[PDB]
Design an enzyme around this catalytic site. Sequence first.
Site, PDB file in Angstrom:
ATOM      1  CE1 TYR A  32       1.024  -0.662   4.458  1.00  0.00           C
ATOM      2  CE2 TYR A  32       0.701   1.669   4.278  1.00  0.00           C
ATOM      3  CZ  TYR A  32       1.183   0.590   4.946  1.00  0.00           C
ATOM      4  OH  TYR A  32       1.830   0.773   6.121  1.00  0.00           O
ATOM      5  CG  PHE A  46       0.920   9.096   5.824  1.00  0.00           C
ATOM      6  CD1 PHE A  46      -0.114   9.689   5.160  1.00  0.00           C
ATOM      7  CD2 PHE A  46       0.692   7.919   6.478  1.00  0.00           C
ATOM      8  CE1 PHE A  46      -1.336   9.080   5.087  1.00  0.00           C
ATOM      9  CE2 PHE A  46      -0.523   7.304   6.412  1.00  0.00           C
ATOM     10  CZ  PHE A  46      -1.541   7.887   5.715  1.00  0.00           C
ATOM     11  CG  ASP A  47       3.768   3.951   5.852  1.00  0.00           C
ATOM     12  OD1 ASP A  47       5.012   3.977   5.759  1.00  0.00           O
ATOM     13  OD2 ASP A  47       3.151   3.074   6.474  1.00  0.00           O
ATOM     14  CB  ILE A  61      -7.214   2.822  11.194  1.00  0.00           C
ATOM     15  CG1 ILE A  61      -6.778   2.704   9.748  1.00  0.00           C
ATOM     16  CG2 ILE A  61      -6.076   3.404  11.982  1.00  0.00           C
ATOM     17  CD1 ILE A  61      -6.348   4.003   9.150  1.00  0.00           C
ATOM     18  CE1 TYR A 114      -3.587   5.736  13.566  1.00  0.00           C
ATOM     19  CE2 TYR A 114      -3.326   6.615  11.387  1.00  0.00           C
ATOM     20  CZ  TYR A 114      -3.004   5.692  12.336  1.00  0.00           C
ATOM     21  OH  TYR A 114      -2.088   4.711  12.050  1.00  0.00           O
ATOM     22  CG  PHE A 149      -4.651   4.028   2.997  1.00  0.00           C
ATOM     23  CD1 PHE A 149      -3.343   3.956   3.392  1.00  0.00           C
ATOM     24  CD2 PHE A 149      -5.575   4.535   3.871  1.00  0.00           C
ATOM     25  CE1 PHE A 149      -2.968   4.395   4.616  1.00  0.00           C
ATOM     26  CE2 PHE A 149      -5.197   4.971   5.096  1.00  0.00           C
ATOM     27  CZ  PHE A 149      -3.892   4.901   5.469  1.00  0.00           C
TER      28      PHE A 149
END
Lengths: 896, 107, 115
Positions: free
Chosen positions: B26, B36-37, B56, B82, B99
Site C-alpha cells: 500500500y 506518509f507511508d 484502523i 485516526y 490509501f
Amino acid sequence: LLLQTNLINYVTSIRPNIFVGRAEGSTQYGKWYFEVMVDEVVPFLTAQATHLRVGWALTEGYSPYPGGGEGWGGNGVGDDLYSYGFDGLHLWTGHVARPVTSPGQHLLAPEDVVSCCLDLSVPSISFRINGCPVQGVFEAFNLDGLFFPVVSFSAGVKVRFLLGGRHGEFKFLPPPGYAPCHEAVLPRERLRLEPIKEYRREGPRGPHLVGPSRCLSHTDFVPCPVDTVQIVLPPHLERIREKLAENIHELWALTRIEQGWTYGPVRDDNKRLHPCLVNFHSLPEPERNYNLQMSGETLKTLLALGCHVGMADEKAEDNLKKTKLPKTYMMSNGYKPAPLDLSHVRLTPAQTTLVDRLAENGHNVWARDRVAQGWSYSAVQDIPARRNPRLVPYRLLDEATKRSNRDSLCQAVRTLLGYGYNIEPPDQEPSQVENQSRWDRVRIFRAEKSYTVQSGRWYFEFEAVTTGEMRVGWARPELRPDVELGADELAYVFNGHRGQRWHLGSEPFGRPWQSGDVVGCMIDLTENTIIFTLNGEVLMSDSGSETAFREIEIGDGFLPVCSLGPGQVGHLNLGQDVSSLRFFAICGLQEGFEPFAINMQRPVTTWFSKSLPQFEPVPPEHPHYEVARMDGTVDTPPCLRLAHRTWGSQNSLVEMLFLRLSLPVQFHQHFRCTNRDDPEIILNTTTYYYSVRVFAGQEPSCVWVGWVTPDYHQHDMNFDLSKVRAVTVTMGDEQGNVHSSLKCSNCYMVWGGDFVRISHTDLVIGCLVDLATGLMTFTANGKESNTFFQVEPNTKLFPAVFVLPTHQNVIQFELGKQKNIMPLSAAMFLSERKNPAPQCPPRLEVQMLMPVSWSRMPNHFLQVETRRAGERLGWAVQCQDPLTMMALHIPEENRC
Amino acid sequence: GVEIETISPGDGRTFPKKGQTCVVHYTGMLQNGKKFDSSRDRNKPFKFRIGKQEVIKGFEEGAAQMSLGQRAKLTCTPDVAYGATGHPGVIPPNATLIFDVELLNLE
Amino acid sequence: EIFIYWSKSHNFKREEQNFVVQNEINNMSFLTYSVQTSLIVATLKKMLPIGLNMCAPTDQDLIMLAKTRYALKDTDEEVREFLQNNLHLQGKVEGSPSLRWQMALYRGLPGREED
C-alpha cells in the site's frame, strides 16, 4: 516549512511528428483521430506506480524537461495547461486528475485501445476506451499553437501508436467526420516518433547536446500572398501583354507531344491527347482571354513585388524564330511549338529569386482560393471530400512541386528577358519570423561550478555536428543564463559560424568550421592565455597571435561552456577517456595541457540554461527595478512599492513585468456549501483582501491585477487576458447530460482598463478571496466589478501584478484590510489566522518572472525504443529499464 | 466512512473472511496529496488479521470489500481513521486518508 | 643543432638582425622586428613537438635534471655519462598518477616501439 524529499520515477513523452492546428484561413482540416494500443504494462516496476497517459498537447509550451518540475515531478501529459491527458480512470490537466466514468473503468492495462479525438471546431478533446465512450470532455481551451498526439510514460510500458492507413488499423471506426492522423504528415517530412523538445540525444561516440528546435507555428499553414487587385496596368506591360501570354498558352502542352498524350483533331485539351499546339483561338474563348490576363496577372504580381521593365537592345522579335521541329509535328492545321518559340536567352540570379517568389505567390493565391471553397490538406487526395495533398503554403510544399511550379514562370520570365525588358529586383528588407522569444534561441551547457579551474593547463574538445551558430570556450562560474556568450565579461568563447572571438563583444578570429570539425579549446592559467584549435591546427588572429585571449585574470575560476543555437547539435568531449579525444595529441599533448576531465571517474556533471520562466526574487541590486518595503502609518497599510529606476534615462528598459508576492493563500479543503469592525464577524470570517495602487502616470490599461496559481510560467511580452491559459473539463452522464463543468486556468486577473477623462488620480484595484467558498472578486475604485472567479478546493494562489511600466512610479502593493475582511497576512501565516492587524513580514517579498534559469542535466536518461512494428501494428514505443530520482519539494511553490 | 474506488479489478470472487491474514502492499496520502507511508518503499508486504482490530477501522471495512489481486483506493474519514487526536508527527488531527491498496494474497 | 649554434653565438644574432633589416623580410606572412619573429626560433617552435614525441613522459624527469647540466655549461659530450651516471631517474607509472595516463598514450603510439 521544511523542504520535503521523496523518490520519484523519471517520466518521458513521445509524439508523432504530426501537428494540426486552427487559424483564420488555415489550410488544415480540423477533426483528428488517433489510437494507442497498450501491449504490456508492469504496474509497479519501482515503488511508485508506473506512469502511462495518452492525450494531446500543444507546441507552444508543452516541454516536459526530464527530472524535476511542477508538484512532485514526473510531469507527463496533463501536468500543465498545454497538455490534455487520460490514464483510464482520470482526465488530467493543470496537474489535476479528475475522475471520469467509463464502462468498466480501470487504469491502462494490456490489451487496451484508447481512441483520442480532437475537434478543434468547438474546441474539444473526446476519448474512448476499448470502444466505450469516456464520459468526460475537455473543451473551450486555447487554440494558439499546434496540437500533436502524445503519450507520457515511465519505465515499464509498451504501447503502439495507431495512426490509420499504413501506420495502424484503428481496431475501431473513427467517429464520423474524423480524419486519421496519418493524413497530417507534411509533404516534406516522414512520419516518425520523436521526443518533445530535448537538449540531449545519444550519439555514435557519445552524448550529443542539442540546441532548440524550430516548430511550425499555426500561422505557417495560412497562405498569405500579396494582393493583386489594386494594380493599374501600365502601358509598357499592355504593350507586351500578348507574347508573354501567347508563350504560356500551350507551354504545358509542349512536353507531351509525340507521346501517348499526342493531340488529335477529334478531341481537344484534357482528353489524354491534350497538346493542341495550333493556337488559343481554337481553344475556348473564356479560358483563352483568361490565359492572357493570367500572363497579365503574373506581371501584376511582378508589379506588386517591385519588378519594373526597361527596353534597351535589339528587339528580340526580329532575332527570334519559330522552329517546326520534327518532334511536335501535328496534322491539325500545321505544326508549331506549343508555346511561343524562343532562341538562346539567359537569366540572372535576380530573376531566379524573383521567379521563386513569383511562383510562391501563385501557389498561395491558388491555395487561398481552394480553402475559401472549403478544401483542406490531406496527404492522401480525396476529391469528393474536398481535400488535397498540395493545400499548403509554398514554404511547406515539396521540392518536386516547387520545381514544377517554378518551371512555368521561369519560362515566362525567360521569354520576358529575351525581349530585353529589365527584371528589376525590389528593395531588400531584413525581417525576422519570430522576435518576441529571444530566449528560446540559445541553450548554454556549462560544467558544474565544482569543477572550476584556477590553475594548471587544461583542454577539452567540442565537435560541431552541424555548422551553425554555436560557441565553445571558457566561462567564469557566475555565468548569466540569459546573455549571449561573450557579450558580457564572463566568457571567452569562439563562434564558428563565421570565425569570431567573443568577450565583451566580437572580433573576427579564425576560419569558420564545417560539419564534423573538432574545436579543441585549451587554457594555460600559468601564462593566462586561451588557445583554440580547429582540427589540430591552432587558429591565429589576423595580427599573428597564436592565443585567442591573453592576460586573463584567474579570478574565481573558469569552466567549459558551450552554446548551441536553434537546430544545432554538438558533442562536448571533456576527455574522461583520453583515446576519445581525436586531435589531442596533434596539438595539446606535448605542450603540457591536460584533458579537463582526466580522472573524473564519474562523467562531468553539466548544467544547462533551462528556458522555463520561474518566479525569482527581485535582485536587491538591479539596474532598473527597485522595491521599497514601506511600513504602515495610520492612513496607510504596509506596502511594497515598485519603482522604475531609469525611466526617462537613455538605458531605460520598458517591457512587461510579471510580479508576484512570494507566499500563496490556500483555499480550504472543504467548502461550506455541502471603519471599526464587528469582532465576532471579523474573527469568524474567511474573506481576505489586498489592493494595488496604480500611481498616477502609470497607465491603467497597462496593468493586470489579481492572482496566479503556482504554475504560471508564461513570460509573454505581449500580454492580455486572452493569452491566459484556460480549459473547461466537463463531466457528463451516459446520454451526455452535463454533471460538472469545472473551469481551470492559471491566471485569475483583471485589466485596469476595464475600470477607466484625464489621468491624475491613482487606481486602487482591490482583490477579495473567500477561502471557504472558492470565490474571488475585484473592486475597481470602491465600486464592485463584474468579474467573479470560482476555484476548486485546496488551490494555491499568489498575489500578482503584470505591468508594463509607463512611469517611474509604477505600482504599489497594499496589504491592508476592509471592514470585516481580514488582511492577507492572516491567510498567509498560520500564526496570524486571528490577527486583524495588517503585517508585512520579511518572507513576503515581490518576485519577478525570470526567462531562463540554470538546471542540472541528469546523469542517466531513459532509454526508449521506437520502431514501425508493421503496416498493421503501427508505431511501437518501449521503455523498460527503470530510473528514479530523489526529489526535493519546495512546499509553498509546489515545485520540485 | 470508507469509500472504495476500484483501480484495477481482481477476482471479484474470493473476499477476506474474518481470520484470514491479508497481505496488502500500500501507499498512503493525506487528502491534500502528501505521502506518509508506503510499504513498497520498505519492500515488504504488510500482513494483518482481519477481525483483531490491529489496523484502523476504515482500513478494515475497506480491505474487506476488495477481492484477491484487486487494486483500489480507500478514502478513510477521521471517524473511521485516526481522528481528532492524530498520529503525532505523522498525521495532523481531523484528517482524511487515501490509501492505494493492492490485496496481494489472502493468508 | 642549428638552434644551439644560434644561441651559442652573439655576432651571428646581430647579422641576422642585419639580414632582416636590409632585406625587409615580413617574417609574419612566412609564418602564417624582434628576435621573437626569427625564423630560426619559429621553425624550432613548430618542430619541437615532433622532437618531444620521442621522449616518453617517464623521461620528462631526466630532462628536468639535465636542465641543470646545461645551466652550468657542462661539456656536451659528458652529459652522456651525466645521464648514465644519473641513471635511476625514470619514475613509476603506477606511483605517479598523471603518468598513468601520459604513459598510456605514449605506449599506444604505433610508431613508438618499446623495442
